Enzyme design. Structure first.
Site, PDB file in Angstrom:
ATOM      1  N   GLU A 389      -4.776  -3.531  -2.708  1.00  0.00           N
ATOM      2  CA  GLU A 389      -3.782  -3.269  -4.030  1.00  0.00           C
ATOM      3  C   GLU A 389      -3.017  -4.162  -4.460  1.00  0.00           C
ATOM      4  O   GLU A 389      -3.273  -3.628  -6.240  1.00  0.00           O
ATOM      5  CB  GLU A 389      -2.343  -2.614  -3.117  1.00  0.00           C
ATOM      6  N   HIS A 414     -11.689   8.198   0.299  1.00  0.00           N
ATOM      7  CA  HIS A 414     -10.421   8.520   1.568  1.00  0.00           C
ATOM      8  C   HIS A 414     -10.371   7.320   1.376  1.00  0.00           C
ATOM      9  O   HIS A 414      -9.262   7.587   1.275  1.00  0.00           O
ATOM     10  CB  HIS A 414     -11.524   8.388   2.533  1.00  0.00           C
ATOM     11  N   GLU A 415     -11.133   6.081   0.446  1.00  0.00           N
ATOM     12  CA  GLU A 415     -10.176   4.882   0.128  1.00  0.00           C
ATOM     13  C   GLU A 415      -9.731   5.110  -0.664  1.00  0.00           C
ATOM     14  O   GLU A 415      -8.146   4.343  -1.129  1.00  0.00           O
ATOM     15  CB  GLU A 415     -11.096   4.187   0.070  1.00  0.00           C
ATOM     16  N   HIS A 418      -6.183   5.777  -1.177  1.00  0.00           N
ATOM     17  CA  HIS A 418      -5.114   4.288  -0.566  1.00  0.00           C
ATOM     18  C   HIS A 418      -4.330   3.879  -1.851  1.00  0.00           C
ATOM     19  O   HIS A 418      -3.453   3.929  -2.109  1.00  0.00           O
ATOM     20  CB  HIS A 418      -5.138   3.532  -0.062  1.00  0.00           C
ATOM     21  N   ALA A 422      -0.893   3.876  -3.283  1.00  0.00           N
ATOM     22  CA  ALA A 422      -0.171   2.566  -3.297  1.00  0.00           C
ATOM     23  C   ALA A 422       0.336   2.788  -5.307  1.00  0.00           C
ATOM     24  O   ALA A 422       1.672   2.742  -4.821  1.00  0.00           O
ATOM     25  CB  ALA A 422      -0.821   2.007  -3.603  1.00  0.00           C
ATOM     26  N   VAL A 426       4.834   5.079  -3.349  1.00  0.00           N
ATOM     27  CA  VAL A 426       5.249   4.077  -2.940  1.00  0.00           C
ATOM     28  C   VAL A 426       5.642   2.731  -3.287  1.00  0.00           C
ATOM     29  O   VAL A 426       4.652   2.032  -3.094  1.00  0.00           O
ATOM     30  CB  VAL A 426       4.100   4.051  -1.145  1.00  0.00           C
ATOM     31  N   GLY A 428       6.693  -0.001  -4.444  1.00  0.00           N
ATOM     32  CA  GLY A 428       6.546  -1.455  -3.723  1.00  0.00           C
ATOM     33  C   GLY A 428       5.208  -1.661  -3.139  1.00  0.00           C
ATOM     34  O   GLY A 428       4.459  -0.902  -3.841  1.00  0.00           O
ATOM     35  N   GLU A 446      -3.567   7.952   6.894  1.00  0.00           N
ATOM     36  CA  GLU A 446      -4.350   6.917   7.728  1.00  0.00           C
ATOM     37  C   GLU A 446      -5.028   8.977   7.537  1.00  0.00           C
ATOM     38  O   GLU A 446      -6.026   9.554   6.900  1.00  0.00           O
ATOM     39  CB  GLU A 446      -4.730   6.575   9.158  1.00  0.00           C
TER      40      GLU A 446
END
Length: 679
Positions: A389, A414-415, A418, A422, A426, A428, A446
């Site tokens: 990230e 899937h990835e 993330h 990010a 979420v 920060g 996950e």
């Protein structure tokens, strides 16, 4: 002291009672493990190794069996050596045996070593001969070596070199040579720890040995089976090269390794050896650019570049990765993104100017080629792929069905999630803020990833067949309760598959809780999240729901599939005047106050259309969300009924749910698709 045994297991108390003659003869014909607590520091072992005359007896006996060993009989050389290794080991750690630590004492083994080396059977060959070499290398490791001893290893190295293709693939043969080199190097490096390398007995006296390592390192004709040997050669060429009078000559051979094997493992090693062992100074005396070499390597493995969305989405790829794939991955990103924003309700990035402003994906040709990514980019490659990230970068590789259960698209779906978590969910650093002080989101991070991987264009999120298949296992426990899944330190691999099931369960059966949960993470309300997890965990009712929902998934497995991008995306759509598309989309979705942006890509253009939607009287938030899904999916479907092929590229989401002063449902709505009008 004892004078009886029992059971062919021997105690030190008993060995201490034997004459040296009796003792050394016993050791000749026992295995080293038969000595009880041999490596343990006892009053017994203290007494045993504390006797300088006894150890010397052991050394002498090894010297004698080194003079006499044959291809069929080893004369206990292994046992003699293990016993001595035990001596030096305990001497290192325990005071009172400290005389065993002194290099001056350790040199007492050299005459025995020489004896072994002068034996005509000191060669690679049969198991005994090979074991003898293995044992020797390990003893040097704990004891001492001479310039004289090291050079006697020369024939063995030559013998190995001359038989590389047979020997290097043999475990026992290869272990022997490796143990020998590693052993000598360990003793030598130890002796010169902070002392000036120039003041060593062997310095400049090991040219034949060094020359033997050059030959191994610079072998040239390596295979998969024999590569490790030349790797050793180069690594230890650097190590022993320190005891050469000509620095620049050693570095020359290292630089040759780089040229000979390039962007292969040994060039990376050779390059490491130059920077670490030789100050990163070349044979010409000027600083080698390690950074450029890595940049050259990445360009060799990732020569192709593909750019999307005005350079905000970049793929760097190997020459063998299909262009079709590249496009499919782009469109797959779009599908996952639209589902994600629907559920989460936010499409505005949380921080300004983070690296994920540009998403970068580096795709190596193969799992084989993938490994050099750790070399090149300093990241683990013990994975099917990895999103970093702080770099906004995803690293992966193309793969065959035999190589991985997941295809490249699936793993990306899937990835990619993330990347979405990010950037948009979420606040920060991902994995490193208030939400991570306690272990709150492990199931969620996950689980939502597996989940959003199943995004589709017009049907929302569907379960993937593979994960459904996993769920087909032992019903009777092994199956997680709701409480267990929410509250993970270790768990078996099934943990993530149940995390998925929770996410899916909440999505299908309890949207209100899903939304409340996401709003908590989104707002950084750790307390609201914990309260929600608590209610779910404490409520036996929600668990029963969940338990049957797991069964429902297991049942769906028969007719399930993998949501993958349609071939429709790759079709030649042809021209359609941009303004008609916008008007067509605006009418069909009843959008208001709309605006558009067009973006340039490698193979096509795209537009993003943003409008306000205001509907009828609100039926509650969660009922609103449900109907908005259905009303929007319905619009995407009906638009595909038109003759223009490009509508089949459309994706859509809504965000910022609210209600008007008059209780009318209101959303922000976003459409994305291919654009074929230049002007």
């Amino acid at each position: 002291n004892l004078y009886f045994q029992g059971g062919t297991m021997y105690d030190f108390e008993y060995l201490n009672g034997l004459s040296y003659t009796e003792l050394t003869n016993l050791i000749k014909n026992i295995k080293w493990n038969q000595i009880n607590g041999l490596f343990n520091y006892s009053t017994g072992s203290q007494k045993f190794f504390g006797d300088k005359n006894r150890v010397q007896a052991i050394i002498n006996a090894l010297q004698e069996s080194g003079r006499t060993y044959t291809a069929n009989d080893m004369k206990g050389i292994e046992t003699f050596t293990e016993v001595l290794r035990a001596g030096f080991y305990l001497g290192y750690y325990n005071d009172g045996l400290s005389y065993l630590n002194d290099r001056n004492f350790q040199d007492k083994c050299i005459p025995a070593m020489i004896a072994i080396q002068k034996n005509p059977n000191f060669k690679l060959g049969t198991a005994v001969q090979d074991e003898v070499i293995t044992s020797l290398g390990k003893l040097i490791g704990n004891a001492s070596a001479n310039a004289e001893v090291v050079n006697n290893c020369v024939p063995v190295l030559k013998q190995f070199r001359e038989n590389l293709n047979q020997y290097a693939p043999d475990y026992v043969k290869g272990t022997a040579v490796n143990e020998l080199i590693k052993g000598i190097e360990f003793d030598f490096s130890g002796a010169a720890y902070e002392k000036d390398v120039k003041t060593m007995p062997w310095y400049g006296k090991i040219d034949p040995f060094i020359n033997e390592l050059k030959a191994l390192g610079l072998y040239g004709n390596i295979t998969s089976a024999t590569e490790w040997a030349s790797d050793v050669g180069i690594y230890y060429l650097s190590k022993f090269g320190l005891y050469s009078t000509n620095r620049n000559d050693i570095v020359q051979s290292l630089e040759k390794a780089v040229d000979m094997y390039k962007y292969g493992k040994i060039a990376f090693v050779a390059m490491e050896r130059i920077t670490w062992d030789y100050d990163g100074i070349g044979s010409n005396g000027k600083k080698v650019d390690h950074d450029k070499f890595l940049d050259d390597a990445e360009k060799h493995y990732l020569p192709k570049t593909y750019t999307f969305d005005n350079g905000t989405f970049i793929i760097r790829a190997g020459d063998k990765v299909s262009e079709e794939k590249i496009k499919r991955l782009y469109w797959a990103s779009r599908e996952v993104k639209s589902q994600f924003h629907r559920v989460v309700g936010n499409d505005k990035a949380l921080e300004v100017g983070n690296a994920d402003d540009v998403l970068t994906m580096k795709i190596f040709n193969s799992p084989e080629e993938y490994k050099f990514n750790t070399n090149i980019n300093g990241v683990s490659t013990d994975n099917g792929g990895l999103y970093i990230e702080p770099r906004g970068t995803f690293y992966t590789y193309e793969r065959t069905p035999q190589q991985s259960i997941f295809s490249l698209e699936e793993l990306f779906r899937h990835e990619y999630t993330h990347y979405l978590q990010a950037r948009y969910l979420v606040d920060g650093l991902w994995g490193q803020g208030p939400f991570y002080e306690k272990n709150r989101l492990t199931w969620f991070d996950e689980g939502t990833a597996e989940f959003f991987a199943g995004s589709t264009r017009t049907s929302g999120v569907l379960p993937r067949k593979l994960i459904l298949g996993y769920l087909a296992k032992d019903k009777v426990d092994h199956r997680y309760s709701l409480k267990k899944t929410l509250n993970s330190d270790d768990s078996d691999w099934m943990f993530y598959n149940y995390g998925f099931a929770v996410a899916h369960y909440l999505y299908e059966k309890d949207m209100p809780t899903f939304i409340k949960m996401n709003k908590a993470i989104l707002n950084t309300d750790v307390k609201s999240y914990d309260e929600i997890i608590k209610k779910l965990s404490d409520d036996a009712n929600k668990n029963t729901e969940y338990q049957n929902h797991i069964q429902e998934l297991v049942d769906k497995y028969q007719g399930a599939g993998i949501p993958l991008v349609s071939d429709d995306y790759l079709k030649d759509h042809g021209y359609k005047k941009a303004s008609e598309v916008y008007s067509e989309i605006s009418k069909a979705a009843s959008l208001t106050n709309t605006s558009v942006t067009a973006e340039k890509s490698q193979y096509f253009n795209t537009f993003t259309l943003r409008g306000t939607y205001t509907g009828e009287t609100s039926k509650g938030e969660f009922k609103d969300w449900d109907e908005m899904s259905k009303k929007l999916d319905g619009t995407l479907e009906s638009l595909a009924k038109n003759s223009w092929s490009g509508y089949k590229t459309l994706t859509a989401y809504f965000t910022n749910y609210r209600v008007t002063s008059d209780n009318k449902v209101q959303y922000d709505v976003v459409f994305h698709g291919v654009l074929t009008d230049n002007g």
